[PDB]
């Protein structure tokens, strides 16, 4: 399963965290620090997979953002690597030329995108068009 999902910026501001198993607040803060210190230093030469405790994190850069999933050691590295892109592509189609700020100012929206595509640690919806169908239609309703 997925343990957690982070979106961090270069600096360390943590622009989204979904936690899929109940850590302490101090625990979380430390995970967030660690995820940052690992990922930020690693160049395009280095792989996107890094083992970490007896979890392991898949990560991918986009602009100044870092899209990290933390998974069990037995979970499929590449499947998750592309789940990240599937998700970022939805974000780009729902925000049109999506940027870091789009997620700041529509944070409460980003959470609802995430929850269509992942739930209870596992993948929920892979289908980009279907996600956008549920986003736009049934954004409308106040």
């Amino acid at each position: 399963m997925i343990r957690f999902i982070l979106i961090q910026n270069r600096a360390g501001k943590t622009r989204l965290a979904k936690w899929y198993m109940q850590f302490d607040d101090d625990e979380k803060q430390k995970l967030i620090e660690e995820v940052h210190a690992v990922v930020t230093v690693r160049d395009a030469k280095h792989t996107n997979f890094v083992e970490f405790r007896n979890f392991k994190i898949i990560y991918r850069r986009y602009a100044g953002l870092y899209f990290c999933i933390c998974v069990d050691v037995n979970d499929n590295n590449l499947a998750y690597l592309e789940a990240i892109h599937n998700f970022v592509e939805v974000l780009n189609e729902y925000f049109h030329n999506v940027c870091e700020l789009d997620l700041v100012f529509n944070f409460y929206k980003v959470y609802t995108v995430v929850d269509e595509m992942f739930l209870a640690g596992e993948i929920r919806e892979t289908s980009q068009t279907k996600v956008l169908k549920q986003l736009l239609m049934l954004q409308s309703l106040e």
Partner: peptide, 9 residues
């Protein structure tokens, strides 16, 4: 630096 830069292309 440059929060406005697009994630993709």
């Amino acid at each position: 630096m440059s929060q406005i830069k697009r994630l993709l292309s």
